[PDB]
């Protein structure tokens, strides 16, 4: 599953025509596009590799 | 809200809660160069390979 969530503050004067406003005109833009399942799990580093990345010298 | 709002003005932000759009378009570039050189060359020679009898003393 994919979750696309948006949050922000919109001035009720930049809304143009068909109730549409570009995200660049929204203050406090919070945009999340996350996924689940093994497809998302395959994009995680892995505990040992993450530890080496954060601690291993060079 | 009971506040006064002009009709013909450009709707600039005026209060604490007002929102404004910022276009970064930042571009800075600085460069610096310097060089110096100094060359001196000298080379002197002198030789008879044949000396007159009267000059053999010197
Ligand atoms: C800015 C201007 C300011 C003014 C500057 C003034 C001049 C500033 C000084 C310039 C002259 C340099 C001095 C060199 C001798 C010296 O003092 O400094 C030596 C160390 C070097 C220091 C120099 C640093 C300077 C620092 C720089 C300073 C610059 C400013 C110590 C030394 O002494 N070392 C020494 C030692 O070595 P060892 O250590 O190992 O033991 O012993 C061995 C063995 O001795 C030899 O044995 C031979 C036999 O075997 C024997 O012959 P034989 O006949 O017997 O057979 C033979 O006898 C003979 O020559 C026989 C006979 C030859 C006659 C032939 C006709 C030549 C005429 C030639 C005519 C010359 C025309 C100019 O003599 C002479 O009448 C010499 C002529 C005198 C001319 C006088 C000028 C009148 C003005 C005439 C004016 C003309 C007007 C137009 C024996 N020769 C000797 O004894 C040595 C000496 C005997 C002295 C007794 C004679 C009366 C001196 C009477 C008075 C002299 C006082 C100065 O003669 C000389 O040269 C003297 C040259 C003087 C020139 C000055 C000019 C002034 C202009 C005046 C200007 C104001 C030598 O080889 C060795 O000397 C050598 O190698 C030298 C080599 O040869 C010659 C190379 C010259 C290249 C140019 C330098 C190039 C160097 C450049 C790099 C630095």
UniProtKB/Swiss-Prot annotation, chain B:
The basal body constitutes a major portion of the flagellar organelle and consists of four rings (L,P,S, and M) mounted on a central rod. This is Flagellar L-ring protein. Belongs to the FlgH family. Assembles around the rod to form the L-ring and probably protects the motor/basal body from shearing forces during rotation. It is found in: Cell outer membrane; Bacterial flagellum basal body. It comes from the Bacteria. The lineage of its organism: Bacteria, Pseudomonadati, Pseudomonadota, Gammaproteobacteria, Enterobacterales.
């Amino acid at each position: 599953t994919e979750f696309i969530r948006f949050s922000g503050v919109v001035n009720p004067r930049t809304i143009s025509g068909s109730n549409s406003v570009p995200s660049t005109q929204v203050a406090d833009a919070r945009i999340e596009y996350v996924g689940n399942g093994y497809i998302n799990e395959a994009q995680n580093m892995g505990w040992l590799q993450r530890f080496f990345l954060n601690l291993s010298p060079m | 809200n009971y506040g006064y709002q002009p009709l013909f003005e450009d709707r600039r932000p005026r209060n604490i809660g007002d929102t404004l759009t910022i276009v970064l378009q930042e571009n800075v570039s600085a460069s610096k160069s310097s060089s110096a050189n100094a060359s001196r060359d000298g080379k002197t020679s002198f030789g008879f390979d044949t000396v007159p009898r009267y000059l053999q003393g010197l």
